[PDB]
Amino acid sequence: ETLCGGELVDTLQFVCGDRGFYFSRPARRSRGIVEECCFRSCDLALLETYCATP
Amino acid sequence: LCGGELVDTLQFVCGDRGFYFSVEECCFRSCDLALLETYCAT
Amino acid sequence: LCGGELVDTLQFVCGDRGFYFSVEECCFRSCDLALLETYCAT
Amino acid sequence: ETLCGGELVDTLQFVCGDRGFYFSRPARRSRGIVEECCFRSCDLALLETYCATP
Amino acid sequence: HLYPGEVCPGMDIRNNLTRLHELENCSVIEGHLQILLMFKTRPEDFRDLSFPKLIMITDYLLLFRVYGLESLKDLFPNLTVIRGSRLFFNYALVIFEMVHLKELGLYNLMNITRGSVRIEKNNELCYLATIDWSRILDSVEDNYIVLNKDDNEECGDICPGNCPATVINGQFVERCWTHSHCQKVCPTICKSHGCTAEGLCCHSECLGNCSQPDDPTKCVACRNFYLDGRCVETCPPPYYHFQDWRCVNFSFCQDLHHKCKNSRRQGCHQYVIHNNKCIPECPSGYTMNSSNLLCTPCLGPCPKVCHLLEGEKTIDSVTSAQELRGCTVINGSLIINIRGGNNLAAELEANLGLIEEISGYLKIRRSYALVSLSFFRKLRLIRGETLEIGNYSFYALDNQNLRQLWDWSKHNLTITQGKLFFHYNPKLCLSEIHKMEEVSGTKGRQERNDIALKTNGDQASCENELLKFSYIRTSFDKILLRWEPYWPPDFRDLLGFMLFYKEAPYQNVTEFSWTVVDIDPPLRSNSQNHPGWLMRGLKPWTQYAIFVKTLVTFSRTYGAKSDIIYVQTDATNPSVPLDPISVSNSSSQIILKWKPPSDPNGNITHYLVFWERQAEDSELFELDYCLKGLKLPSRQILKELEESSFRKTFEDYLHNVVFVPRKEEHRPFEKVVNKESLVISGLRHFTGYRIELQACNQDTPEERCSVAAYVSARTMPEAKADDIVGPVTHEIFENNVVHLMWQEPKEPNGLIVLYEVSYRRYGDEELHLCVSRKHFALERGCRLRGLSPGNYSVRIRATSLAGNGSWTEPTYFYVTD
Amino acid sequence: HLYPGEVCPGMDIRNNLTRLHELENCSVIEGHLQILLMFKTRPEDFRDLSFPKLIMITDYLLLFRVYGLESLKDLFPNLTVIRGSRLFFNYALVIFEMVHLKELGLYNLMNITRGSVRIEKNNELCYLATIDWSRILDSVEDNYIVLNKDDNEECGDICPGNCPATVINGQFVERCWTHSHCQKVCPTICKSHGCTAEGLCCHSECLGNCSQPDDPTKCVACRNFYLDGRCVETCPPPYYHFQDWRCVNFSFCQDLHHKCKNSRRQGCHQYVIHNNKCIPECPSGYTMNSSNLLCTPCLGPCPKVCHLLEGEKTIDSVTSAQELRGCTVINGSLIINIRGGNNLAAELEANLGLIEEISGYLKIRRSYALVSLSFFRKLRLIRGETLEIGNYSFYALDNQNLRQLWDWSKHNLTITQGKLFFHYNPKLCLSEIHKMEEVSGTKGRQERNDIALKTNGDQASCENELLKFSYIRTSFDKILLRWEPYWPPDFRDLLGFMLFYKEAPYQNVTEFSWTVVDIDPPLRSNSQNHPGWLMRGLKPWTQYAIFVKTLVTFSRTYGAKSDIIYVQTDATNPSVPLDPISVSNSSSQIILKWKPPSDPNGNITHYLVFWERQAEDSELFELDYCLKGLKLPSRQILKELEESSFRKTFEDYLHNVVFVPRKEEHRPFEKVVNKESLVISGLRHFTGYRIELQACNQDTPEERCSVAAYVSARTMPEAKADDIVGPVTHEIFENNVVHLMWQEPKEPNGLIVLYEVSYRRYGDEELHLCVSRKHFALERGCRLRGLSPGNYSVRIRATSLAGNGSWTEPTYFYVTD
């Protein structure tokens, strides 16, 4: 099942939860979130990798 | 369309469920059935 | 449009050249100015 | 100047004249007359070569 | 009768009439006749030439710029049947640029077996609309007759008719060939077998015309075959069919083949024998046998190759395709381009469809009438050795009516090299193209912009995603709509659903008037909310065809539509009966007429009508009608799409940037049933009536009735109702006061207003006096005063509403002198 | 006042408010501020946080899903100016998915230097329509505010206003930030220099707000630059501009460069000095000097290469293009895709246009607002080393508004490899594409179906073949059209001309309502016949815009059009003056009103109006008004194209096959000029008038006048006109017959119909008698008979048309007892 904008944030903070999303610096790759979960189906691990501590 | 006459539409879209009054959304605006279905509550 | 009244169109498209009568091509058909220009001959 | 159907026949029998157009047998090549004079400009000799005796 | 004369195989005459003498002895033509390119000719040179011997043309007749020819009634007075074996651009009779022609004159033409007729650009020919092509051809709609003298001018079609006439669209019209002859039309029992002048049916085998009915020996043209005059349906051995019109002995075919063999004519064919047919060459699977002329089946699957000049051949007509008839393997490429307007599926399937493999590419460009590519019945392999420029093997361009490409349930295909190419096929859809791609096996042989998404099927509803309706129910006046939700993989692409609805009289309606309404896309339920919609205004008791189509932005398109569902709304009350008029013819008979309401809104069960009695006007009793002045009545869009796309793309950019992955008064009435009129009886004389007219279209489930209609009806009076009856008694007082007594007409014409008493003595004059209602009541009649002595003759006139009644008989009373 | 506090370069706060304490000492931000992704927050946790120190934001402010935030009036009470050096998707203030927000609260925002504001999808925010963005931004039309609480709901905008108000479209409205504060609006003399609360203008350098007017030392934000509080327009040496908002000593820039050099931060820039500016890197033509930090010009033409990640970069926003600012040679490929609706030419030209060579390909897809590609000011060479898939170097797809590609009077271009590609550019035309091909030099590098003929410019009249008009002249009512003939190389392709005409009020009308008419193509003259056409029906004296466009079948298209020529027809007669009403207020004054005719059809020179006198009705003299009943009045197409093409192709086939190569009543009137009304004087009392109203719109060249309008006007009577004057003389005969003499009112109110004589004796009663016109004429007055002895008091009442006149004074006459 593919999920896109609007509901993507709703899915986040539920799969991630408690802890937020990390941020170091801008350091465009153009593979960020939309062409990972909206354009193509994405699994739980690809959402978990956007968490902060784990 | 306005009050009194408009009651037929509410009884149409709600049947034997009843409704509470409020016409300000159909006399000046357009009746899109989205407000009518939620006007009557079970 | 038909005879009598139609003469204005012939004088319009021919000016001071005159014309010979014949309305059977405008009362039932459409006046396309192709017949009108050749109706009046120098 | 290019000439096409309708007026092509009118031009013929005037450039050719007197004598007609030769005819032996069907013996389609698809270079007959239209793509010689209508599609592309054609000269006097290309019309003369369609005569019968000369 | 037989055909006495040389068959004289088809030829053409040009540049002089001195070449027209080759037809001096010609009963039939085994070929085509072409008379064209005549310039130095005059009508004075045509009065002499005549060919009564010519009967039947095998291929076609073409006339092109024959100056000085005014009518063919002297050229071909006996042209009966044109066989049309091979056509001239799918036409069997072409008359083009025919200057100086006035009338066709082919008053002997009966039947054209195969082909059509194209006559145009004559600028002088009339007598065309006075013909019946239905009895001449077999496909009238394939004709082409324009730009003649008939349309732009008014050449009078004066002809006898006397001569038979027939209907064409909605009226009869005589069918005449020339000013002296007319088309022979005879009963339909002889569909094509022919019929004599009297009306006797000819022989079944016979065709067109015959001399002795029911006798093949005395026919002029027989449909099946020909042999020795007395033609038969199929000649027995040792006679083999020849050129599909006659048969001859084996010796004839053998010597013809020998003549073609020894004389190396470039156009001659090595005629063979195959199933009692001296055909030019038998099809694939047979080999020429040196010993005997028939070609026995071979012990090997060798197809009949079909070599093409310069590796190309354009198919734009029936005669273009006929050159490939019998061919099965093409040693080249085919480009199909049929600029038409009339479908050619039948003839293309007859000529093509026996081909299996194509060495090169197959190209279809600008073809219009092609509704499908099914005429390639046995097309299997496209080798594509001679690849099209741009490295393609299949082409498609500006096909306005290419609906279906092939039936993939049974058909097979194979493409070796090259790639597909489709562009501007509004009736072809990407589903069929992708099925082509899958079946062919060239899936990995595709690139961008070879199959345009926005051109193929742009006006064909073929997204092939079905939508159901959850529940609907229609009430007395309106209807509610609801259907299951739909969501593309990216839900932001759904901009809402299109709703299509129109009134469908009968059960069938064309798919994609058609009023539409925008629908707001539903909120994301993530319990699911059915979108639904409510209609606004309709005509009750009508069949409505509704369907909903999704509208999704182009990014792949994943729209959806629903089936055409017909919903029947309910009936309502009718309107006032139109034009309510009431008339009266007899003293008690009043006839009232009406029309059904403009919108009946229901089956009119009955009419409820009431007539009511009224009293005389109150002010009439209080008005005096002897005062002077006594006149008593004689009673635009792309911006929204881009706004949505721009919102979506900004949201996408924000998501990309932010997130980073980790490292009732009983008036009498009657129910008028099945009648728009009513006759009522039993009415009082000279009495008005108030008529309340109303209609009902429903009786048993409560009377659903319309509103009342009020009309006024007045009856004529009786004959002697206003005349005063009873003796005219008078009381005389001491002052000679005459007090008149008379009984009033208890049943008058409405009411008597006044009386006119005229008493005259012998030698005296006539006097008058008004007796009003109050005068007749308070005084109990009249009261005369001051009468001169003598006997007076009294006549009394009663003045009623209708008018003045008849004078009473002269009454004589004598007062003392 | 100065900025006391750390500059604290821009940062973002996420996932907890405990990170929001870094702004404890921050007067300015040298960067961007982002507060986003707040979920586990409540409004009770926001009442404490406040940052009065924050004044100016350099880049932008973004808020994205900060739960529990209801108003920013407590967060940023002193945000004055947002510099907007670098934007977030061409936006300077983004408020997105801002749940729980009620009011903006930024009651201290004054000026945003560069960018726009996009607020959407808050679902709770109101107090938006009560703001004036014109005084805040510089380009209001670039804003984007939708899907808030304001539209779908009705959040009441209750606020003081007291507070200033201004017009927006056609009405005034108060401009308030919150329920307690409102936007500060002060006179326009201080365009942006700022202004105190009273109204005194601040310093010219100053911006937004100031404490002491006309004093840069006591300002809060100055537009030009900043230095040591007392900011100046441009600081002198040894201070160099820094980040376009402030300047510092050379030591600061030098140590910052040293810090970036020794500390290998991936984001640090080796800051240099170039024209008193500590910029991150000076442009092409300068080299970093080890000794001193400024970059001296180099002795060699070395451009500033611009290396691109993965050889690609999509330009969809201002911030996307800003990364290439100062770059001149691209080591990759550019794909431009601006999903917009607002043109970005200015900012694209500012950022791009300094690039010269592109190593790869340049692709323009789906861009909408791009009206031209002129922003590539210095684009010279397209190397095309990294060729696009399909071997292309230039791309174009779905450009809805690509009008002009480049100006080829001056511009130059060069393409090394690849081929062009254009598709679906309805505003781009094949002439510009062929100029592309000629100038570039890739003429022999083109194939079929790379530049579609039927998609580019399909709705843009650009066939660039002009058509002249031979002669035209307009008459009183209609107009005749004629133009020079036109013929494509194959004359059969001309199906006729399209004629476009419409009424143009002013001299300018848009090119390609617009009623059209079909034209039959002219006959082949081979003397040449001008086609011409005649119009049918029009509105006279109106400016008409006409132009003719040829319609030629697509086989190359060689159509032609004419210039938009404006033709003025003539004027005609006017209509009846609307609403003709006449009223009377005085005995001789009648006021008549009218309106100009609905179609004046000409400048109304004057109004010709006539008032006429009438006589009393003839039947009135012959009617008696004492009889009972005396009520005296108180006075679809493709088929035709294919038919043409099919005719042409059959003619071509015939030509191919046949030919083979060898081996007045002066009623008073007045010319009412420049007035829709008239007042007339001198009218007789109680006398009607027939008014004939008509209008003319032309006087000197014969009076072109309208039809007459008839209205009726009646005057009121005098005061004592109906009273009988003169002595009431009476003649008494032997029979005591009283013959009354009285002089009639020679000037009555119309006419006196009857008289009422009332003579009463002492103790007697009043008698009455009718004196009609015939009675007054034949008897020469009244004639009384049978009067009782005694003196009678006589009062006479005259009955006129107006009514009953005043009774005459009691006249006493004594007859013998």
Author numbering:
A (entry chain D), D (entry chain F): 6 to 32, 37 to 63
B (entry chain C), C (entry chain E): 8 to 29, 43 to 62
E (entry chain B), F (entry chain A): 1 to 161, 168 to 518, 528 to 541, 545 to 573, 577 to 656, 691 to 718, 766 to 919
What does the article say, verbatim?
To reveal the mechanism underlying IGF2-dependent IR activation, we determined the cryo-EM structures of full-length human IR-A and IR-B in the presence of saturated IGF2. We expressed and purified the full-length of human IR-A and IR-B with a kinase-dead mutation from HEK293F cells. The 3D reconstruction of class 1 (determined at 3.6 Å resolution for IR-A/IGF2, comprising 16% of the particles; 3.7 Å resolution for IR-B/IGF2, comprising 14% of the particles) exhibited a T-shaped symmetric conformation with four IGF2 molecules bound at the canonical site-1 and site-2. Our cryo-EM analysis shows that, even at saturated IGF2 concentrations, only about 16% of IR-A particles and 14% of IR-B particles adopt the symmetric T-shaped conformation with four IGF2 molecules bound, while most particles are trapped in asymmetric conformations with two or three IGF2 molecules bound. Structural comparison between IR-A/IGF2 and IR-B/IGF2 complexes indicates that the site-1 and site-2 binding modes of IGF2 in IR-A and IR-B are identical. In addition, the 12-residue extension in the C-terminus of α-CT, the unique structural element that only exists in IR-B, was not resolved in the cryo-EM map of IR-B/IGF2 complex, suggesting that this structural element is not involved in the ligand binding or stabilizing the active conformation of IR. The site-1 binding of IGF2 is mainly mediated by the interaction between A- and B-domains of IGF2 and L1/α-CT and FnIII-1 domains of IR in a fashion similar to the site-1 insulin binding. In addition to these interfaces, the C-loop of IGF2 also makes weak contacts with the CR, L2 and α-CT’ domains of IR. In contrast, the site-1b interaction in the structure of IR/IGF2 complex is mostly driven by the salt-bridge formed between Glu12 of IGF2 and Arg539 of IR. The buried surface of IGF2 binding at IR FnIII-1 domain (424 Å2) is considerably smaller than that of site-2 insulin binding (681 Å2), indicating that IGF2 engages site-2 with much lower affinity than site-2 insulin binding.
Insulin receptor (IR) is a receptor tyrosine kinase that plays critical roles in cellular signaling, growth, and metabolism. IR can be activated by two highly related ligands – insulin and insulin-like growth factor 2 (IGF2). Consequently, IR-B has an additional 12 amino acids at the C-terminal helix of the alpha subunit (α-CT), while IR-A lacks this segment. Here, we present cryo-EM structures of full-length human long isoform IR (IR-B) in both the inactive and IGF2-bound active states, and short isoform IR (IR-A) in the IGF2-bound active state.
